[PDB]
Amino acid sequence: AIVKMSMISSKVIGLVNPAGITQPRRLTKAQTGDFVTGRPEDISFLQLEKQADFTVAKAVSDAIEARLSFAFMLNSIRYVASELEDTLGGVYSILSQELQLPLVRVLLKQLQATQQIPELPKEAVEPTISTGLEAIGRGQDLDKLERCVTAWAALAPMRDDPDINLAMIKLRIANAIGIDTSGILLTEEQKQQKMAQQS
Amino acid sequence: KLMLALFPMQTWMRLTISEYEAKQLLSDPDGLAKVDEGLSMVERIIMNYIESNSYRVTLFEALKQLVVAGNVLLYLPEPEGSNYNPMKLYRLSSYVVQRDAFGNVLQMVTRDQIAFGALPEDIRKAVEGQGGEKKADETIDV
Amino acid sequence: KRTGLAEDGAKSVYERLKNDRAPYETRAQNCAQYTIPSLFPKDSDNASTDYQTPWQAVGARGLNNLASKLMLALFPMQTWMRLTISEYEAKQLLSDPDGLAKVDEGLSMVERIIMNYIESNSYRVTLFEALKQLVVAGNVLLYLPEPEGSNYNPMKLYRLSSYVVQRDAFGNVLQMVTRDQIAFGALPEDIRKAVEGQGGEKKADETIDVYTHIYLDEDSGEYLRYEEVEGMEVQGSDGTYPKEACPYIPIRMVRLDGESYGRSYIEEYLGDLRSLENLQEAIVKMSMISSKVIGLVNPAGITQPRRLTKAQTGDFVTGRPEDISFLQLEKQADFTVAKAVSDAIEARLSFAFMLNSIRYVASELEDTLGGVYSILSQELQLPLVRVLLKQLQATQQIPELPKEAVEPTISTGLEAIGRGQDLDKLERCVTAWAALAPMRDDPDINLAMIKLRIANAIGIDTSGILLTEEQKQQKMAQQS
């Protein structure tokens, strides 16, 4: 509607009042200047008076565009998923079970059928957990590991503090983080056997 | 946005081990770390295969089709040597599906118009045998 | 003697297929007319023709900006394809990870040689022209001539009007004919002798039509290529190319099932261009009308223009100011509404053409806006990287001794800009390893375990960079 009103507006028509004295022939057959007989009020141009309707139409169109943009994320990685992209329509979690997992379940088995990713663990089935949000960047294992290693870096000044037990604190903070320290942290037996081997 | 979220540059799938199921049959945690390293290698190889076969373009086309008309069938041909074989995207107009209430029942039929002369050898001989001679231009429905 | 698809002849098939190419030519001509018209002139159009400039003048800017952005993203100055190795399939047939490092170095050397060849042949300008033609009328045929020594041989770009293509629903069936005119002066010797034998006496000026036709072998074969000059082919040109490494590489911007090619990016914004150009033409014509000045003098008054004209500065003249008046274009509100609508159209087109904006101007900017630029990364990039290879490989310009894998190409931009992201995943792990030094004298922890764990978390391959227990043991034993 707005575009068609604009097209209507584009056309120019010269409304000349018959009761007047201005004759368009002498207007057309005249160069720049060239004083001509007539009155300006006689010549008038048709105009599209439909303005308020234009304003209300523009307001409604703006509102519809705003709601659609909010719906299409035009008015906005994990901030490109979890927040925004999984909040403006929860389809990043329904298409992670329809497109992501099925593809990695078929791609892995085919690549096993050929000799490109030989698997022979005999321990587990190595389940695929594509579930992007869950495993966007190999999970939140690097953050946990760096935090626990940084914490272990501290407490170094207080090594010569017989009252406290460094290993106990280290294991307690590891448990608090929830990280697995089966091999990272040497248990009592591991420490004793390492000391014996060192001799 | 969905293509930058679902399928990003960084690994998008993780291979889990279900700890305490492999620990019992394992010598020292170094074995668990080696298992995790092997899983990471498998993930890297999956990245390599997905990127080498131009899967991203087909996935983006499928994603756009899903947004406009949510449905697409992605056929993954069996690997043959190393020559790239991108998944042949099937739009809505080319395939049909049948589902029960649960979706357990599947009956998927895909229609592809390949002109004689480009028909896989087996199909070329099959169509030639069923009838007489097929023009190299006319389309053959498979 | 030619089999199916070629018995009638290259000329006949080209004439037959030209009728199916007409709609694409017409839409390309319309798109060119509303954008820069000189880009895609009509066949009849020739010298002495004036290309009236479009009124809107946003289509030209948008086309130029899209072409520039696509050149910058798809084909940057630095490397834009990465050679893969299919890890752990070579390790089974490889001695030590140092061999993997050497293989990676060789692949990098191959990539550098490809960059050198692409730059030395002015591929950038031809590719820019091809991208612009794709944006205005998405279809181009890029012929890559067989390398000869080291002399420059830029690809011979073929505009839409110079060739035809035939595709089935999949597009597997190809029957490509390219028409080019050579004025009997640059004709290679074989073609010149062929035409001289077929005909009588020719002139060095008159044009000679040369048709190159390639088609699928009727049997389980590859593409058959031959050149037809006038009725009969030339015995010299009997080349045969594999279905994979075809150096003609037809291109399409927007691919639709059934259609053999076309659907330019500007094709689906042609309505916006139409409306904006109509509005701008109306506004400009209104301005031109307003430019004319006419002195409307009321006859009922007493002011006579003759004494007004025959008077110097000052020179008091009898009359009344109200007698003399000038007609004006009072069409003002219409001007406001037309300006508002034209501005809205310009804004939508501008952000659609990226006017109101390597890796950010690509996987973003030229991605969220522009639909798919990754179709030109599988239709232009990969095919060119797969022909440059096997051509530089048939000639002795790149090493040819894989004997491990086929070394796939991941040329497609987003995936490979700057040899992937290996350098970041390496600098991060090296920075992590640089740390943990102060806690080395900590009997509680095993540093190697944390190093391996962080390497696994990053996902980088640590086969050679990090010495495992065994290799460290042999190294220490040998050092003694």
- Which tokens is A58 given? 């523009």
**N-to-C CA span, chain C:** 77
Q: Is C450 helix (H, G, I), strand (E, B) or coil?
A: helix
Q: How far is CA C457 from CA A138, C449, C453, in A?
A: 6, 12, 6
- Pick the closest to residue C182 from C219, C247, C127, C230 (CA basis): C230
Q: Is C294 helix (H, G, I), strand (E, B) or coil?
A: strand
- All residues at 6 or more sequence positions from A196 whose CB lies less than 8 Å from its CB, including other chains: none
Residue C93, judged by CB atoms within 10 A of its CB (0-12, 13-18, 19+), counts as: exposed
Please check whether residue B74 is in contact with residue A103, taking contact to mean a CB–CB distance below 8 angstroms.
yes
Identify the helix (H) or strand (E) that includes residue C479. Answer: helix C469-479
- H-helix segments, chain A: 2-10, 24-28, 52-72, 101-113, 142-153, 166-177, 188-198
DSSP A114-160: TTTS-----S----B---GGGGTTS-TTHHHHHHHHHHHHTTSTTTT
- All residues at 6 or more sequence positions from C191 whose CB lies less than 8 Å from its CB, including other chains: C182, C208, C210, C227, C229, C234, C236
Between CA C137 and CA C38 the distance in angstroms is: 13
DSSP 8-state code for residue A185 = B
Between CA A156 and CA A154 the distance in angstroms is: 5
Please check whether residue B2 is in contact with residue B72, taking contact to mean a CB–CB distance below 8 angstroms.
no
- Which tokens is C143 given? 């012929």
Please check whether residue A149 is in contact with residue A179, taking contact to mean a CB–CB distance below 8 angstroms.
no
**N-to-C CA span, chain A:** 91
Between CA A115 and CA C86 the distance in angstroms is: 11
- Which tokens is B117 given? 């002369």
Between CA C360 and CA C366 the distance in angstroms is: 8
Between CA C280 and CA C53 the distance in angstroms is: 12
- Which tokens is C18 given? 């030209």
**N-to-C CA span, chain B:** 35
Q: How far is CA C466 from CA B52, C98, C115, C306, C448, in A?
A: 27, 12, 32, 102, 9
- Which tokens is B107 given? 């009956």
Q: What is the dihedral of CA B66, B70, B71, B72, to 10 degrees?
A: 0
Q: Which of A81, A114, A121 sits opposite B5 (nearest CB)?
A: A81
Does C275 contact A7 at a Cβ distance shorter than 8 Å? yes
Report angle CA C216, C222, C228 to the nearest 5 degrees. Answer: 60
- All residues at 6 or more sequence positions from A81 whose CB lies less than 8 Å from its CB, including other chains: A92, A132, A133, A136, B5
- Which tokens is A81 given? 């998923």
- Which tokens is A187 given? 């248990």
| A107 contacts on B by Cβ (under 8 Å) | 46, 49-50, 76
- Which tokens is A47 given? 């105009």
- All residues at 6 or more sequence positions from C224 whose CB lies less than 8 Å from its CB, including other chains: C6, C214, C215, C216, C217, C240
Between CA C256 and CA C9 the distance in angstroms is: 29
Between CA C59 and CA A68 the distance in angstroms is: 26
- Which tokens is A183 given? 């091999």
- Pick the closest to residue C242 from C381, C130, C389, C141 (CA basis): C389
C341–chain A Cβ distance below 8 A for any pair: yes
Experimental approach was cryo-EM
Query: Which residues numbered 152-191 in C keep a CB inside 8 Å of some CB on B?
Result: 166, 168-170, 172-173
Per the DSSP assignment, residues forming a β-bridge with C253 are: none
Helix (H), strand (E), coil (C) string for C83-113 = ECCCCCCCHHHCCCHHHHHHHHHHHHHHHHH
Report angle CA A16, A20, A22 to the nearest 5 degrees. Answer: 70
CA B130 to centroid of chain Cα atoms: 31
| B14 contacts on A by Cβ (under 8 Å) | 128-130, 134-135, 138-139
Between CA C117 and CA C311 the distance in angstroms is: 77
For C421-452, give one letter per residue: b (16+ CB within 10 A) or e. Answer: eeeebeeebeebbeebeebeebebbbebbbbb
Between CA C375 and CA C373 the distance in angstroms is: 5
Does B118 contact C173 at a Cβ distance shorter than 8 Å? yes
C246–chain B Cβ distance below 8 A for any pair: no
Residue B36, judged by CB atoms within 10 A of its CB (0-12, 13-18, 19+), counts as: buried
Please check whether residue C233 is in contact with residue C226, taking contact to mean a CB–CB distance below 8 angstroms.
yes
- All residues at 6 or more sequence positions from C25 whose CB lies less than 8 Å from its CB, including other chains: C160, C161
Report angle CA C170, C171, C172 to the nearest 5 degrees. Answer: 90
For C17-47, give one letter per residue: b (16+ CB within 10 A) or e. Answer: beeebeebbebbbbbbbbbbbebbbeeeeee
Q: How many residues does chain C have?
A: 480
Does C4 contact B112 at a Cβ distance shorter than 8 Å? no
Between CA A159 and CA A161 the distance in angstroms is: 5
Q: Which of B16, B33, B79 sits opposite A127 (nearest CB)?
A: B16
Angle between helices C447-458 and C422-434 (to 10 degrees): 160
Report angle CA C352, C354, C359 to the nearest 5 degrees. Answer: 125
Between CA A171 and CA A181 the distance in angstroms is: 8
Between CA B124 and CA C216 the distance in angstroms is: 14
Per the DSSP assignment, residues forming a β-bridge with C142 are: C157
Please check whether residue C153 is in contact with residue C165, taking contact to mean a CB–CB distance below 8 angstroms.
no
Type of residue found at C444: D
- Which tokens is C112 given? 């550098």
Report angle CA B135, C219, C144 to the nearest 5 degrees. Answer: 100
Q: Is C279 helix (H, G, I), strand (E, B) or coil?
A: helix
- Pick the closest to residue C144 from C248, C63, C1 (CA basis): C248
DSSP 8-state code for residue C465 = T
Please check whether residue C343 is in contact with residue C215, taking contact to mean a CB–CB distance below 8 angstroms.
no
- Which tokens is B57 given? 């373009």
Angle between helices C10-34 and C123-136 (to 10 degrees): 80
- Which tokens is C456 given? 């696994």
Between CA C290 and CA C197 the distance in angstroms is: 68
Q: Are strands C156-158 and C140-143 parallel, antiparallel or unpaired?
A: antiparallel
Q: Are strands C294-297 and A33-37 parallel, antiparallel or unpaired?
A: parallel
Report angle CA C71, C142, C214 to the nearest 5 degrees. Answer: 160
Phi, psi of C186 (to 5 degrees): -100, 5
Per the DSSP assignment, residues forming a β-bridge with C371 are: none
Strand order in the sheet with A33-37: A33-37, C294-297, C324-326
DSSP B27-39: SSHHHHHHHHHHH
C224–chain B Cβ distance below 8 A for any pair: no
Q: Which of A81, A91, A126 sits opposite B15 (nearest CB)?
A: A126
Please check whether residue C252 is in contact with residue C138, taking contact to mean a CB–CB distance below 8 angstroms.
yes
DSSP C295-344: EEE-TTSS--HHHHHS--SS------GGGEEE------HHHHHHHHHHHH
Q: How far is CA C319 from CA A148, B123, C459, in A?
A: 99, 99, 94
Between CA C393 and CA A149 the distance in angstroms is: 50
Q: Are strands B73-75 and A33-37 parallel, antiparallel or unpaired?
A: unpaired
Q: How far is CA C209 from CA C41, C187, C242, in A?
A: 20, 10, 26
Residue A38, judged by CB atoms within 10 A of its CB (0-12, 13-18, 19+), counts as: buried
- Pick the closest to residue B106 from A113, C170, A131, A102 (CA basis): A102
Task: Report the 10 Å Cβ neighbour count for B48.
Answer: 23
Type of residue found at A149: V
| Resolution of the solved structure (Å) | 3.2
| A156 contacts on C by Cβ (under 8 Å) | 438-439, 442
Between CA C342 and CA C329 the distance in angstroms is: 20
Phi, psi of C164 (to 5 degrees): -135, 155
CA C475 to centroid of chain Cα atoms: 53
Does A136 contact B25 at a Cβ distance shorter than 8 Å? no
Type of residue found at A18: P
- All residues at 6 or more sequence positions from C335 whose CB lies less than 8 Å from its CB, including other chains: C283, C286
- Pick the closest to residue C181 from C158, C147, C152, C214 (CA basis): C158
Q: Is A54 helix (H, G, I), strand (E, B) or coil?
A: helix
Between CA C211 and CA C232 the distance in angstroms is: 11
Q: How many residues does chain B have?
A: 142
Size of interface A-B (CB pairs under 8 A): 117
Please check whether residue C236 is in contact with residue C190, taking contact to mean a CB–CB distance below 8 angstroms.
yes
Phi, psi of A160 (to 5 degrees): -80, 55
Residue whose entry in the numeric block shows the structure tokens 């440059």: C388
Between CA A16 and CA A10 the distance in angstroms is: 19
* Minimum Cα–Cα distance from C304: chain A residue: A35
Q: Are strands C175-182 and B109-110 parallel, antiparallel or unpaired?
A: unpaired
Between CA B29 and CA C449 the distance in angstroms is: 9
Between CA A134 and CA C99 the distance in angstroms is: 36
Q: How close is the nearest chain C Cα to the Cα of A100, in Å?
A: 18
DSSP 8-state code for residue C52 = P
